[PDB]
Design a protein around this nucleic acid. Structure first.
Ligand SMILES: Cc1cn([C@H]2C[C@H](O)[C@@H](COP(=O)(O)OP(=O)(O)OP(=O)(O)O)O2)c(=O)[nH]c1=O
Ligand SMILES: *P(=O)(O)OC[C@@H]1CC[C@H](n2ccc(N)nc2=O)O1
Ligand SMILES: [Ca+2]
Ligand SMILES: [Ca+2]
Ligand SMILES: [Mg+2]
Ligand SMILES: [Mg+2]
Ligand SMILES: [Mg+2]
Length: 342
DNA sequence: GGGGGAAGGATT
DNA sequence: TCACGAATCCTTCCCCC
């Protein structure tokens, strides 16, 4: 297997540079509000000219402006970013039938049907970079290796506007030398957890008794890290099929009033059924988040598919059960659907 | 004890 | 941002043989 990973560079701000080329080479900051329009918002992303002086993703725009008051600040245009992304993903599909779209700016390709060496993989990567630049004026970073994990790590090491191969020998080296915290799927927790078990590299997981790891981080992760460390990881490039689909919305205030909560619950159902599309669930859960941010949840499985009308009627019954069996005030409410037909 | 299943916490 | 709330793992609890 040869896997190629593509990560679009500083994507939202780069799209703004493409739609207004006069911006290129000057600081550009894309602002995100998350529906909270009474303030200045936050930096969604900034181009490298802005990052150079400390304007980085996540900081409040009021703080960014104290650093670069004369940068160009643009509110997010999510629908445009999504459209440009979708067009680029379509360009990538021409290079492989085996593609996994991981996010709005990330895709994996299994290119094993077209190349079986890294020199030609690199050439294919160059062609992809040129094609996306030609057609959409977007620069990207390409990572190439023997599996998804090292392909992503390769792109992380090479961005922006990069291309990097991690060949078989470099994989072996990284298994010994790469900080296990930089492995995809390992957050701040887990990382600290296995640092307390003496594990700092992928190779270290081979000198623990397995159940000790497993006990700390769980069976799935343990198997994951060990298979990486043994250089046996080979997960296919494929469209991920969800096991559940849902939506949980925040109410304007705490409530324990059924009639007050219902419109929110119904909104969650409508949004969920849009997401479901042609998928038909046989199970429904109602999920309540209490004011202290705990979860209370109740599910039902049917021997048949759930119509939207049954989703409405059953969700109220489940919510009624939640209200009867727990005394806490509810702040967020929604539904999750699972057990899909076919 | 443990098969079976649901609640709901934990993690990315 | 795409990592606020979705999706997924998985421990704990509980029924009851
Ligand atoms: C997109 C995103 C990344 N991160 C983290 C992941 C990293 O630690 C770091 C950057 O990850 P990256 O993957 O490098 O960010 P990105 O490539 O998706 O974004 P951009 O194109 O704008 O440059 O920030 C978030 O916390 N939230 C997010 O929404
Ligand atoms: P991981 O490697 O740290 O993160 C992997 C993916 C990226 C997004 C998604 N994610 C991460 C963190 C949180 N809090 N929520 C998410 O959905 O995991
Ligand atoms: Ca968001
Ligand atoms: Ca419990
Ligand atoms: Mg990117
Ligand atoms: Mg990304
Ligand atoms: Mg990490």
């Amino acid at each position: 297997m040869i896997v190629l990973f593509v990560d679009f560079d500083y994507f939202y701000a780069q799209v703004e540079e493409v739609l207004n080329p006069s911006l290129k080479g000057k600081p550009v900051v894309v602002c995100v509000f998350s529906g909270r329009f009474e303030d200045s918002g936050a930096v969604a992303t900034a181009n490298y000219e802005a990052r150079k002086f400390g304007v980085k993703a996540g900081i409040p725009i009021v703080e960014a402006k104290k650093i670069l008051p004369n940068a160009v600040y643009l509110p997010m245009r999510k629908e445009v970013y999504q459209q440009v992304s979708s067009r680029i993903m379509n360009l990538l599909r021409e290079y492989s039938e085996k593609i996994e779209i991981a996010s709005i700016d990330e895709a994996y390709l299994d290119i094993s049907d077209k190349v079986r060496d890294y020199r030609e993989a690199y050439n294919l990567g160059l062609e992809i970079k040129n094609k996306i630049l030609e057609k959409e004026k977007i620069t990207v970073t390409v990572g190439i290796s023997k599996n998804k994990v090292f392909a992503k790590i390769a792109a992380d090491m090479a961005k922006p506007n990069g291309i990097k191969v991690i060949d078989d020998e470099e994989v072996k080296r990284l298994i010994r030398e790469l900080d296990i915290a930089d492995v995809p799927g390992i957050g701040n927790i887990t990382a600290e957890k296995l640092k307390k078990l003496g594990i700092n590299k992928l190779v270290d997981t081979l000198s623990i008794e397995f159940d000790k790891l497993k006990g700390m981080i769980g069976e799935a992760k343990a198997k994951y890290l060990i298979s990486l460390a043994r250089d046996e990881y080979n997960e296919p490039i494929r469209t991920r099929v969800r096991k559940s689909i849902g939506r949980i919305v925040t109410m304007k205030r705490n409530s324990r009033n059924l009639e007050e909560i219902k419109p929110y619950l119904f909104r969650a159902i409508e949004e969920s059924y849009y997401k479901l599309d042609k998928r038909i669930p046989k199970a429904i859960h109602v999920v309540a988040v209490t004011e202290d941010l705990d979860i209370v949840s109740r599910g039902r499985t049917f021997p048949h598919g759930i119509s939207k009308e049954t989703a409405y009627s059953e969700s109220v019954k489940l919510l009624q059960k939640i209200l009867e069996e727990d005394e806490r005030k509810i702040r967020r409410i929604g539904v999750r659907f699972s057990k899909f037909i076919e």
